[PDB]
């Protein structure tokens, strides 16, 4: 573990935790014991912006973009119940947390594309 001071200014704070190459096991679900997610976290790596095919509809694809803002992208502290379903499936239901971050990215032309990257 590292203290606040051990992260400040490094950019590490905008990074969701990681598991080692080992941890590739499996977690059990009692299906008779409620479960929740104590901490969901999402860290962006790429932001692609589908381009408008001009008038000539020719099918459009997503294109990479430069992150004009900085390392403020990550969503963290997400939380909610991970209820087990009748059919034996699992559904997560978020309650609260830093569930959104305003991101701004530039493109080929120079156009800034602001979005509200979220999972509310």
């Amino acid at each position: 573990t590292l203290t606040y001071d051990d992260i400040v200014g490094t950019g590490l704070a905008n990074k969701c935790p990681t598991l080692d190459d080992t941890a590739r096991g499996a977690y059990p679900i009692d299906s008779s014991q409620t479960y929740r997610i104590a901490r969901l976290c999402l860290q962006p790596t790429t932001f692609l912006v589908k381009e408008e095919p001009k008038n000539k509809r020719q099918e459009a694809e997503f294109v990479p973009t430069k992150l004009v803002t900085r390392e403020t992208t990550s969503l963290d502290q997400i939380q909610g119940e991970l209820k087990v379903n009748s059919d034996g499936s699992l559904t997560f239901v978020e309650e609260d947390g830093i569930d959104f971050q305003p991101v701004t990215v530039q493109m080929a032309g120079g156009e800034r594309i602001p979005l509200l990257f979220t999972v509310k």
Binding site: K54, K56, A108, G109
Partner: protein, 50 residues
């Protein structure tokens, strides 16, 4: 003295100022090139090469 259309004859045998002259010329032609570019970059639309 010299007619207007002859003012540049003042260099016919002054290798120094003749070089000074062609240097200024080259400067203008290089200058134009640089700035004519910027004009195109400020108005050219890359949105569609087709």
């Amino acid at each position: 003295g010299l007619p207007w259309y002859r003012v540049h004859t003042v260099l016919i045998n002054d290798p120094g100022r003749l070089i000074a002259a062609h240097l200024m010329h080259t400067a203008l032609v290089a200058g134009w090139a640089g700035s004519m570019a910027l004009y195109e970059l400020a108005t050219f639309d890359p949105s569609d090469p087709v």
